[PDB]
RNA sequence: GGUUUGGCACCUCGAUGUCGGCUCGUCGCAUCCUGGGGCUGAAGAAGGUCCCAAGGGUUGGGCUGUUCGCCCAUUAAAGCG
RNA sequence: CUACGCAAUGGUCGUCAGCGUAGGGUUAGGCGGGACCUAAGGUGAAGCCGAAAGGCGUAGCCGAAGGGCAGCCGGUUAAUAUUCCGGCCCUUCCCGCAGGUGCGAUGGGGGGACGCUCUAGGCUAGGGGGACCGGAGCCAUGGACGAGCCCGGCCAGAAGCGCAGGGUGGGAGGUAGGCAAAUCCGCCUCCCAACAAGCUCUGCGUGGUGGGGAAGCCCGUACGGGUGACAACCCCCCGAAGCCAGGGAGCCAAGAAAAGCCUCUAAGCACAACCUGCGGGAACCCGUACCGCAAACCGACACAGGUGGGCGGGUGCAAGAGCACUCAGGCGCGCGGGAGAACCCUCGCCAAGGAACUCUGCAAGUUGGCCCCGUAACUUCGGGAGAAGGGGUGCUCCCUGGGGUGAUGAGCCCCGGGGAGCCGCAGUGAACAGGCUCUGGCGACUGUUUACCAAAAACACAGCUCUCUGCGAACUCGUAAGAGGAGGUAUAGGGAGCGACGCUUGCCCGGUGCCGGAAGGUCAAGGGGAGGGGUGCAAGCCCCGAACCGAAGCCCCGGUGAACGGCGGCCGUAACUAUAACGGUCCUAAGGUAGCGAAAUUCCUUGUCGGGUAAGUUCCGACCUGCACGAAAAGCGUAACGACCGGAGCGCUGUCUCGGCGAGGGACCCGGUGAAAUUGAACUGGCCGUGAAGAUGCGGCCUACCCGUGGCAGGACGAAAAGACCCCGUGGA
RNA sequence: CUGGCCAGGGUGAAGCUGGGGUGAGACCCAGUGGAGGCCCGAACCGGUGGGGGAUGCAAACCCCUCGGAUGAGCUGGGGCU
RNA sequence: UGGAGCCAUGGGGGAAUCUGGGCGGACCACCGCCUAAGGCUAAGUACUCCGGGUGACCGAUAGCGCACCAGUACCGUGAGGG
RNA sequence: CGCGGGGUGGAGCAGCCUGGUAGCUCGUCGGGCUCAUAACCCGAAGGUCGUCGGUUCAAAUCCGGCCCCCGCAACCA
RNA sequence: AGCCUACGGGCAGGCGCCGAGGGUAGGGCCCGUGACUGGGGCGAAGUCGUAACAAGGUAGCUGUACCGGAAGGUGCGGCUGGA
RNA sequence: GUGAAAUGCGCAGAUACCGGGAGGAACGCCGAUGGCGAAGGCAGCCACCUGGUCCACCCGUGACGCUGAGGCGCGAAAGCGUG
């Protein structure tokens, strides 16, 4: 729903923040899997490769399960619902009857108590896990494969969900949420339903810390360096660039396409 | 006002110190430097 | 005449601080007052003009960095360099 | 620390010293490190990469103010003490004895283990009282033999006790999981038990007992030593930010690891082995002086600077770590003595006036705490608000309402209400302690910045748009391996611009950029070889070489503005006149829309009108011939915010008319120590003039006894810096 | 990466609890509560204006005044570019 | 880059064993030289930390930076300066 | 004042470089259509090519001199 | 401290509350006036077009919305007071 | 495509025809001088939740009624905010 403030402060007239309530019944990780001792700094081995990271409350990693066909008719009861710092999603915590405990990325609608499960068999209910080939064309479905047993990579920012188009050979049509449409192989799994706690969208940070406590340092126009700094820079006196938009490497930013021509990963897309 | 100088045992031995000069191979020209010249100390003398 | 704008490029670039104000002046007279005087289209009072004469005087504000101006209120006068 | 010393070091002196010579002095199983653990990071078996050097890198290893681990109170030395000593209390190892039990890991599980803010109940530290307890003494100077004044009335302490808390359900079955090996975890199922008890673990009180124990007086160089009493060692009250601690509640930004430690079983081995007792032994290495907000550290100095953590008492003031005075303790800053000039600094006061000062109220004043009335436009309903503007404030006595602790009653603390009355010029009587208002510009706001001339209207900022990126993502760093991105996945990540919020953000794809176009045009190597050449007696071996097939790029076609960008000229025309709704024509890719407008933009310009002033190149309101606004290098607004820049008032002033007096630190005189830049040499006057055209030094004339001290700054084209401007150099960056 | 620090006041958000209100609501009152790049102000961080200093106490200092002071806060130690 | 051979070789193609194969400055033909794709090999040559011998070499601002307790004092975080 | 563009029928533009040819739209005059005016239709007239000179056989046209118009530039102190 | 008294007391006098009014400060309502500016009404002469009344020559009208020298145009829905 | 045209699209293979796919909006015939609602307004089919309304029987309550300033709710299209 999102909650917001009187304005019994400018910077909190407009601050909103997500509504709780969807987590619930657990606040504290679980001591188990979770516990990851996480690493930050925001640059490889010396030099920074991406500008303005650091800072931002500690935070300690829970550990997902991305893969389900780990567990193959093995079902599982939903048994919380709980936050996590490191996704825009939330995540629901299942203890598996199996006895062992896995975190989800947890599915908009699914519920304490629910059970699930993931396999071929499986039924098409939100929150069960198959190859993509097994699920019904047009229902929508989340945390996809790209390569079979490769891992989910589709489709897990709050809210996101990627749908079933068609068929055609060992290959399903996806949708995905910037709207291309790839084939992807058959025996990817994917998870029944869409993401979830997707007024996330709808946060307003509100003031300028808030960005901090997520860890995004200022960011600085190039327009506002000097030349030696970024080609935006210089010039007397607030200025238009000189044409035309680039970045503080050389290349041009407004429109100039990016990806590998030649890859071979395309044959595989149209949008 | 605060200076420059701001001693600290620690941080003088793993900077300048013996073992550190050897594990560069610029360190170790150093010593091959001041041992050449005569130097009676190669290192930073600290305790 | 040497106070303006310049012309020239002679000392000064191993440096001659470049507007305005303030403070402290001092000098010139081509005199703004005050003192003498001749003409007058000078009745008188008040002026005009020129001559002699700096001894001493030559205000307080508004505006603008201003110099300068304009303005308010005075003044014997609110001098120019 | 001590004994001898004073050349030098000490800004003077020096018998003194942080100085010279010499001799002493630092004592630990429990305090801190190491024979424990892991963090970032470092290193690095395997492994990957790299011309060499070398770069990565799983495990492992190193790496701590973090985790873990057994000492409290006193006494002694000239100098060390949780270290030596005394009392009380512990910890590990090794061996032996007895009693227990499937004992047993580098492995499995548990635990360790965690945020921010606000906080409950108990305690403790610490502190204030006391008519009570114990003390040497003291009645001064008018009064007091007084419930007088003065001093002290604690510390540590095992078991056992109590008072507060903290942790935790107990069973019995199955069992696909914990890279199954488990009686342990984990999941299901079901008798029991439950805003508990029991079992444990802390803190606090008590505890056998052991220490400590003043003021004053006597000795006394130093430091202290008897004293002191068989000292007393008790009762109230205030009370933590500390303890019980892993307590509780709320919140979003969602809050280390590893070992110790419990437990589970593996090999193994069960005459092992661990577990609990009880004895007797064993217990290493390094630090320990002294300085430590400073004369011992960083600043060349005994330098007005800089340096992390804890304690930091009392009275008063609304509170407090604030302010004033003051304990304990520590200091008077390592040149002094005089004077009583100008002038300088820091400071106090001032008649009348009250900004007239000045670029500017710069500076200084005014105002100031608390309690009570009472407060406008505007507003995003929070705010504007401490708006403004007022009143109260001390001391005395009477009456009276609640709280806490006690016990419902007493003292003791903590908030109040109502009457009378007293004294000063004055009651936050000293110290700490906003001046206020109106109106513009810019920027929304807190924030950031040029360390050392700029704190701003600049940067950042939430937020808006564009754009790239389908994941071995794009992008960044790297020759590479690899890494960041991200253990993220389009509600995400990169790049760009704009910059809360409100209302909006027009027209032009000609040129440039980017995006799309399986056709054409052009196009390299290469493919292809018509045709030609050099040589050979030759078969041949060598060369050139046209057609034609040949990518990307460019051409070409089309799109695209919150992409780079651009957004007209000249004539005429309506009752006086003006002006031109209208028209003509040339040109363009298209001719600037809304909204603003002599503006942070207006040259002419102090534009012209209004306003405010006695007077207004500024300021505010208008007009619009906008030299040269204009929509996201945003446009026009906007409450709140601002050590930002402008304009006004009121208050109050030494800013000023216009200056006067006074204070203290210097300046001045005496004693001690004693620099510096600069300096061709000097026996170094004025005026006219001359001179490379600004002379102490030439000429003429004038003035002028020799030498200092306190002062002033016109000159010595005074000092300083081989001019930062200007030009030059086939100089540099 | 791991530790530490921020006197004392003030304002009084959401939530709760009770009452009111309606068909139920929304909503409205009190009380409670204790939010915030909130307010005043020490430590601590800073460096606004003026004066002083200018062979300094000081190769950036002193005094008065001023800004922030639960946060985009300040800070010790251990690291990396 | 030249008419550019010879020697080496990163890429592509890719033989022969004396009727074999390289060279004699494009290329042919003659004439001639030599045997590639494995390896070793004194001496004559270079240098001077060290020892000695000389000097139309210095003689303490010279000569080494150092005649002397010098790569020291001192300066610098440090390399380094000295 | 220094660079450069420009004055051609009543208005607004061609023509100038590649000298002998004044073209275009509008307007003005005549005549039709309409009851009448526009509009539309048919037919005409109108230009010292700013000005004084110069080159040539001939100058709007090429060369110089002023006369006006428009647009740049007027910097470092 | 005064004056009278029949020594109880009265008077003058002094203090306090209230108080016309004056003053300071901030609000509320109403009136007048102001560079300039918005729209309105009337116009015997102007300029521009022709929106509406006859399918008024695109049925008109209407709420709203955007745009345009102007009347007005156009979109969305609506009315008939048009067929 | 129009009155006629042109702009535009097309030899880079359009229009016209067939096959497959995506996606959004509206629901032809039935359909009417028809129905439903308080109004605005409501049209493929299916199910669920639900309002109003009409007929028959004379069974029950026993004037419990009508209107309605204010208040409250609904309210075509266009328009505005977040997605
Ligand atoms: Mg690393
Ligand atoms: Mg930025
Ligand atoms: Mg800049
Ligand atoms: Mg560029
Ligand atoms: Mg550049
Ligand atoms: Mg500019
Ligand atoms: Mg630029
Ligand atoms: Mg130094
Ligand atoms: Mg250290
Ligand atoms: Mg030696
Ligand atoms: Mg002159
Ligand atoms: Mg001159
Ligand atoms: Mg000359
Ligand atoms: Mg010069
Ligand atoms: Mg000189
Ligand atoms: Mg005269
Ligand atoms: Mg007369
Ligand atoms: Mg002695
Ligand atoms: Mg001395
Ligand atoms: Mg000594
Ligand atoms: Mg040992
Ligand atoms: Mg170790
Ligand atoms: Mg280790
Ligand atoms: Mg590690
Ligand atoms: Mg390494
Ligand atoms: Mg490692
Ligand atoms: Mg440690
Ligand atoms: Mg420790
Ligand atoms: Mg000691
Ligand atoms: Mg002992
Ligand atoms: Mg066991
Ligand atoms: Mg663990
Ligand atoms: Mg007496
Ligand atoms: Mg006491
Ligand atoms: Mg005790
Ligand atoms: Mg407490
Ligand atoms: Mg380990
Ligand atoms: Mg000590
Ligand atoms: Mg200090
Ligand atoms: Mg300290
Ligand atoms: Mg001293
Ligand atoms: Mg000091
Ligand atoms: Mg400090
Ligand atoms: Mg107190
Ligand atoms: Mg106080
Ligand atoms: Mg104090
Ligand atoms: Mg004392
Ligand atoms: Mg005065
Ligand atoms: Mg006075
Ligand atoms: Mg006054
Ligand atoms: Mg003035
Ligand atoms: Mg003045
Ligand atoms: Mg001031
Ligand atoms: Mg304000
Ligand atoms: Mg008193
Ligand atoms: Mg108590
Ligand atoms: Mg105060
Ligand atoms: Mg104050
Ligand atoms: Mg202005
Ligand atoms: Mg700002
Ligand atoms: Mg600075
Ligand atoms: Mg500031
Ligand atoms: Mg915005
Ligand atoms: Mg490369
Ligand atoms: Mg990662
Ligand atoms: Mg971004
Ligand atoms: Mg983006
Ligand atoms: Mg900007
Ligand atoms: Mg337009
Ligand atoms: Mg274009
Ligand atoms: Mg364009
Ligand atoms: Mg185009
Ligand atoms: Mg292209
Ligand atoms: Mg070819
Ligand atoms: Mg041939
Ligand atoms: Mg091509
Ligand atoms: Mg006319
Ligand atoms: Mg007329
Ligand atoms: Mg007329
Ligand atoms: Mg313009
Ligand atoms: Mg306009
Ligand atoms: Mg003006
Ligand atoms: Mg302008
Ligand atoms: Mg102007
Ligand atoms: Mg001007
Ligand atoms: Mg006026
Ligand atoms: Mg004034
Ligand atoms: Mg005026
Ligand atoms: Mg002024
Ligand atoms: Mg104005
Ligand atoms: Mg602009
Ligand atoms: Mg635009
Ligand atoms: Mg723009
Ligand atoms: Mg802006
Ligand atoms: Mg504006
Ligand atoms: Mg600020
Ligand atoms: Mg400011
Ligand atoms: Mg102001
Ligand atoms: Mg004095
Ligand atoms: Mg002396
Ligand atoms: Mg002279
Ligand atoms: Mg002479
Ligand atoms: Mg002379
Ligand atoms: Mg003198
Ligand atoms: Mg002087
Ligand atoms: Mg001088
Ligand atoms: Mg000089
Ligand atoms: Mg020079
Ligand atoms: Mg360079
Ligand atoms: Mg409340
Ligand atoms: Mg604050
Ligand atoms: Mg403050
Ligand atoms: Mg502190
Ligand atoms: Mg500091
Ligand atoms: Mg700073
Ligand atoms: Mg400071
Ligand atoms: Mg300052
Ligand atoms: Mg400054
Ligand atoms: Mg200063
Ligand atoms: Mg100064
Ligand atoms: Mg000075
Ligand atoms: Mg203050
Ligand atoms: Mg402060
Ligand atoms: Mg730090
Ligand atoms: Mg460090
Ligand atoms: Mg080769
Ligand atoms: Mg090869
Ligand atoms: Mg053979
Ligand atoms: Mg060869
Ligand atoms: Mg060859
Ligand atoms: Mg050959
Ligand atoms: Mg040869
Ligand atoms: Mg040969
Ligand atoms: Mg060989
Ligand atoms: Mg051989
Ligand atoms: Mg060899
Ligand atoms: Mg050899
Ligand atoms: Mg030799
Ligand atoms: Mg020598
Ligand atoms: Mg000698
Ligand atoms: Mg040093
Ligand atoms: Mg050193
Ligand atoms: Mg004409
Ligand atoms: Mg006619
Ligand atoms: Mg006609
Ligand atoms: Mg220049
Ligand atoms: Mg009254
Ligand atoms: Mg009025
Ligand atoms: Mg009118
Ligand atoms: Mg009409
Ligand atoms: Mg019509
Ligand atoms: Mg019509
Ligand atoms: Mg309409
Ligand atoms: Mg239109
Ligand atoms: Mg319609
Ligand atoms: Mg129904
Ligand atoms: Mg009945
Ligand atoms: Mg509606
Ligand atoms: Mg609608
Ligand atoms: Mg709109
Ligand atoms: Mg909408």
């Known amino acids: 729903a999102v909650k917001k403030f009187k304005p019994y402060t400018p910077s909190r007239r407009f601050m909103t923040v997500a509504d709780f309530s969807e987590i619930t019944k657990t606040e504290p990780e679980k001591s ?43 079902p ?4 919380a619902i709980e936050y996590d710092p490191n996704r825009s999603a939330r995540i629901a915590l299942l203890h598996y009857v199996d006895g062992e405990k896995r975190y989800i990325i947890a599915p908009d ?11 071929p ?16 064309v047009g229902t929508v479905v989340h945390a996809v494969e790209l390569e079979p047993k490769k891992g989910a990579k589709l489709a897990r920012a709050a809210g996101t969900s990627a749908q079933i188009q068609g068929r055609e050979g060992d290959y ?10 790839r084939k992807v192989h058959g025996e990817c799994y994917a998870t029944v339903g869409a993401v979830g ?15 901090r406590w997520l860890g995004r340092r200022p960011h600085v126009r190039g327009a506002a360096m000097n030349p030696v700094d970024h080609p935006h820079g210089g010039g007397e006196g607030r200025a238009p660039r000189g044409r035309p938009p680039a970045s503080p490497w050389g290349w041009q930013t407004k429109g100039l396409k990016t990806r590998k021509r030649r890859k071979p990963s395309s044959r595989f897309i149209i949008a | 006002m605060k200076r420059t100088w701001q001693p600290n045992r620690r941080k003088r031995a793993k900077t ?32």
């Open chain 2, 16 to 47: 300048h110190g013996f073992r550190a000069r050897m594990r560069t191979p610029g360190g170790r020209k150093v010593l091959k430097r001041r041992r050449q010249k005569g130097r009676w100390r190669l290192t930073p003398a600290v305790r």
């Open chain 1, 76 to 79: 599982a009861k939903v048994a």
């Open chain 1, 121 to 136: 068999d499986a039924p098409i209910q939100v929150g069960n896990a198959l190859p993509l080939r097994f699920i019904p």
């Open chain 1, 172 to 181: 399903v049509i996806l949708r995905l949420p910037s709207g291309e449409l």
């Open chain 1, 32 to 74: 188990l899997v979770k516990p990851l001792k996480k690493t930050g700094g925001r640059n490889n081995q010396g030099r920074i490769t991406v500008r303005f990271r650091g800072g931002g409350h500690k935070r300690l990693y829970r550990i997902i399960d991305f893969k389900r066909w780990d567990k193959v008719g093995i």
């Open chain 1, 109 to 119: 609608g699914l519920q304490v108590g629910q059970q699930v499960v993931a396999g």
């Open chain 1, 197 to 211: 706690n997707a007024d996330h969208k709808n946060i307003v940070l509100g003031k300028a810390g808030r960005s």
